[PDB]
Structure formats: structure tokens, C-alpha cells
Design a protein around this ligand. Structure first.
Ligand SMILES: [Zn+2]
Length: 474
């Protein structure tokens, strides 16, 4: 007999097909059957009339590396329907690095002494021994590798340093990492050359992993950064994933037309993917950057002056008699939210066929960007239903089947017999992001229940206590 059947709802199967009335039966960690299951014995037949049963949402871009260890409930994600997270993005991974004061932006993962894993395998073992509520597909970050190996980050790595970093990356992949990410936009890797990145990432071909990247620049020089990324992909001969695609700064508004055209052209000749979050503001370390600081900027946390959390940086700066750019050093380390994108570009990028959804949530932040709690329902409700940017099945595909295919997460991302029972039950009419910039931790509406490997992890608007997630391999 099946353990349970989600009966009477509409199945949106993750393959980008209009929903159809069908039941979903689960046995253990697997979807046993899909269709009219009235004739199948089941221990429970759960009524989900009026709801959609879809595959669990796979987050396209997280910084949950440490959150998985410290807050196993993973409430910000499971409350949104997320069942799997891709970690170790933008060159930032929790492991391998034993360091009491890692360089920003690695601090976005730190709760205080969190960087304690000398080997990547140590980190994966900790996850497997105390599993989180969601599955984890983990990448190793090139900036973490530089921090672990280089005595001086302000220059290109020597061959010896490249050898040490490549060895750590190869061990990580052998242990289960699904790829390597870079973020040369950030200080720890700003001096890394294209060749350094290529040499450290060589093992991806041998292990069948992916190359993910926070491009070197996402503004004035985004074409050069895209070309660098495509070149790295061709040299590595592995799939590339462009993280949180955007065009930032007023001088670049509207340029999504140009960037998406370059990406679409590259996709015709090499393997390229991209993801994005559904908002007009970014968030990361507080950084002295003319473009990030051009517009409205809010502080998310601040080490030297904790009282600044939540404040408007222009006010802080002006009261200190400085521009935002000049006041930044005295406030570091800190985090911020930057209103530097334009709605038409965000919509064009979200609607671009291949764009996967990634929240880019920064879970340890005191006053976080709402994308941490509202990304997926914002796409399903606001964008799909309310604005009609894409039909619901396409919005679901962009956070399920597409993502599972690009990251190579076998037997996940689709409601198919034999696949793992990572599932979401949501009300298409009411699903909505409730988190706002003012109240960024509000739980989404319309998420009825969420299942990971067949076990309910979210029910009655609460974590069930099921630590059902698994560390995944490509
Ligand atoms: Zn990034």
C-alpha cells in the first residue's frame, strides 16, 4: 500500500505542461504513481482539492551553507515550498577553511567561529550526520579556496597556490561537491586572473560538475564579464551557470535586452544557464562601490555599530558628513540591501525562457532582504498569476524541472513515478510572498504542505520536526 495519496488536486508536474487533475501516491521516499489512484490502497488519502501538487522547489542560488548546520529546520526555505538548496555560491563556501575571521563576503555565512571545516568532506559529513529539512547540493567556492591557501589575496595566485587550490577543489568534488563557484567581483578574488580560475576549475570535467559564477562585473563592464564567463566555459568544457543575472545601475537600465541576447547566442554553441531573484534590490556585504551605493541602501547588520542594523545608509552617511561611498570603511564589516535594478529588466530576465529561480537569501542577516522568505511564492503569485508574466506551469518549471536538469539532480524536480517525493501542495489562487522590505521575515501565503523525500517537513504553517534532507550528488 502507498503511505499516502495527495488526492483531488491539480498536478503541475515540472515538465512545463498545463496542470491536470490527478492524484499523487507516495511510498517511502518515492512517488509511486500519478493519475486516478482511487484503486490503489493507501494508508492515508489526503484531500488537496483546489490545490496544486508540484515538485518541491529547488533554490537556484543560496548562501545556506552554514544555515543548514545551525538551523536545521530551514524555515525560511521550507515555508516557501523549497525542498532542495544549491549552496556554495559566488565563490563563497563554508568549507574548506578553518578561520576565525574570514574575509568579507565570506562573513555572510558566519555566526561566530563557523568556519571550522578544514576539508570539504568534513562539512558534508556533518550535514549527513545531522540532516537539515531540505536536500543540499553543495559547491565549493574559489574565494574560500583562496582564503585557505593564499597568504596574500591581493594578487594572482602562483602555480604552487593554484596547485593547492586545485587539490582542495578536486577533493571536494570527489567527496560529493557538485561544482565550483567564483565571485571575482569580491575583494578576495578581484585579483584572480581568468587563467587562475580555469586552472583551479579543471577537475570539473573529470567529476562532471558545473561552474557557477557571480560575474566579475554586472554593470558597465557586464559584456566583458559575460565574455569572460563564456570563455571559461569553453576552456573547462563544462556547463556554466550565471548567478543572479541583472544589469545594475541607472547607466545600465534596459541593458537586459543586450545581455540576454548575448546569453541566448552563447547557449546555441555551449552549455549556459542562469538564475535570478524576483526583486529590484540586491544584498551582500557593505562594499565601497560607486554603483551599489548610488541609490537607496539599507544596512542589514553591522559589526562595529550594531545599532545601525535596519537603517538607511544615506542618513548614516549624511549625519557623519560623508557620501555613502566615503562612510563605508568605518562601518565595515557590515551587510546591506542595494536598490540598484529596474523592474523592466527584472521582468525581462525572469521571463527569458532559460532563467531559473534562485532566492539569494542571506539567512544570517539581522534585517534581511525579503527574498530570503518570499522568492518562490513571489514568482508563482505576483508574477505568474497577478501580472501574467508566464503561465503557472512555466513558473513552476523554472523552479523545478529546469533547475533539476541544469544541476544534474537526478530523479528530482518532476512529479513522475519513480522520482523522489519532494513535493509542494499550494493554493494557486492565494500563493503569495508576504515578506516585504519593511517585514522581511513574514511567511508566505498559500503554501499548504511541503514534502522532502516523502516526509512532510512543512504542515499547518510549522516545521514538522522531520530532518528529511539528503546531501545530493550530480
Ligand atoms: Zn553573488
Amino acid at each position: 500500500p502507498f503511505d499516502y495519496i495527495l488526492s483531488g488536486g491539480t498536478v503541475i508536474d515540472g515538465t512545463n505542461a498545463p496542470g491536470r487533475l490527478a492524484d499523487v501516491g507516495v511510498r517511502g521516499d518515492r512517488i509511486a504513481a500519478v493519475g486516478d489512484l482511487s484503486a490503489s490502497s493507501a494508508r492515508r488519502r489526503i484531500d488537496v482539492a483546489g490545490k496544486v501538487v508540484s515538485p518541491g522547489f529547488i533554490d537556484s542560488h543560496t548562501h545556506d551553507d552554514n544555515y543548514l548546520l545551525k538551523h536545521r529546520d530551514m524555515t525560511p526555505k521550507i515555508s516557501q515550498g523549497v525542498t532542495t538548496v544549491v549552496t556554495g555560491n559566488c565563490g563563497i563556501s563554508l568549507a574548506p577553511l578553518a578561520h576565525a575571521n574570514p574575509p568579507a563576503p565570506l562573513d555572510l555565512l558566519d555566526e561566530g567561529g563557523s568556519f571550522r571545516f578544514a576539508r570539504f568532506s568534513d562539512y558534508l559529513e556533518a550535514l549527513r550526520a545531522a540532516p537539515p529539512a531540505v536536500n543540499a547540493a553543495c559547491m565549493v567556492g574559489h574565494s574560500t579556496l583562496r582564503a585557505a591557501v593564499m597568504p596574500d589575496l591581493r594578487r594572482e595566485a602562483t602555480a604552487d597556490e593554484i596547485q593547492a587550490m586545485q587539490a582542495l577543489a578536486d577533493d571536494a568534488l570527489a567527496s560529493g561537491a557538485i561544482g565550483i563557484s567564483t565571485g571575482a567581483f569580491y575583494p578576495p578574488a578581484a585579483h584572480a586572473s581568468t587563467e587562475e580560475i580555469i586552472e583551479v576549475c579543471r577537475p570539473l570535467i573529470t567529476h562532471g560538475g558545473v561552474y557557477a559564477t557571480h560575474m566579475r562585473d554586472e554593470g558597465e563592464h557586464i559584456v566583458q564579464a559575460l565574455e569572460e564567463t563564456f570563455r571559461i566555459g569553453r576552456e573547462l568544457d563544462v556547463p556554466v551557470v550565471i548567478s543572479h543575472h541583472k544589469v545594475m545601475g541607472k547607466l545600465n537600465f534596459g541593458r537586459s535586452k543586450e545581455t540576454l541576447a548575448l546569453i541566448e547566442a552563447a547557449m546555441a554553441s555551449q552549455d549556459v544557464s542562469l538564475d535570478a531573484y524576483p526583486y529590484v534590490a540586491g544584498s551582500t556585504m557593505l562594499k565601497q562601490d560607486r554603483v551599489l551605493l548610488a541609490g537607496r541602501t539599507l544596512i542589514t547588520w553591522c559589526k562595529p555599530y550594531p545599532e545601525l542594523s535596519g537603517r538607511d545608509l544615506e542618513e548614516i552617511a549624511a549625519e557623519r558628513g560623508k557620501s555613502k561611498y566615503d562612510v563605508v570603511p568605518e562601518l565595515q564589516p557590515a551587510g546591506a540591501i542595494y536598490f540598484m535594478m529596474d523592474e523592466p529588466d527584472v521582468q525581462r530576465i525572469l521571463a527569458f525562457g532559460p532563467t531559473m529561480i534562485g532566492s539569494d537569501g542571506l539567512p544570517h542577516d539581522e534585517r534581511p532582504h525579503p527574498r530570503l522568505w518570499g522568492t518562490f511564492p513571489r514568482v508563482l503569485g505576483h508574477y505568474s498569476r497577478d501580472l501574467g508574466l508566464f503561465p503557472l506551469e512555466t513558473a513552476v518549471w523554472k523552479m523545478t524541472g529546469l533547475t533539476a536538469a541544469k544541476f544534474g539532480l537526478a530523479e528530482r524536480g518532476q512529479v513522475q513515478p519513480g522520482y523522489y517525493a519532494d513535493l509542494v501542495v499550494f493554493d494557486p489562487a492565494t500563493v503569495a510572498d508576504s515578506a516585504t522590505f519593511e517585514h522581511p521575515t513574514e511567511r508566505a501565503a498559500g503554501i499548504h504542505s511541503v514534502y522532502v523525500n516523502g516526509a512532510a517537513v512543512w504542515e499547518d504553517q510549522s516545521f514538522t520536526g522531520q530532518h528529511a534532507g539528503r546531501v545530493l550528488n550530480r
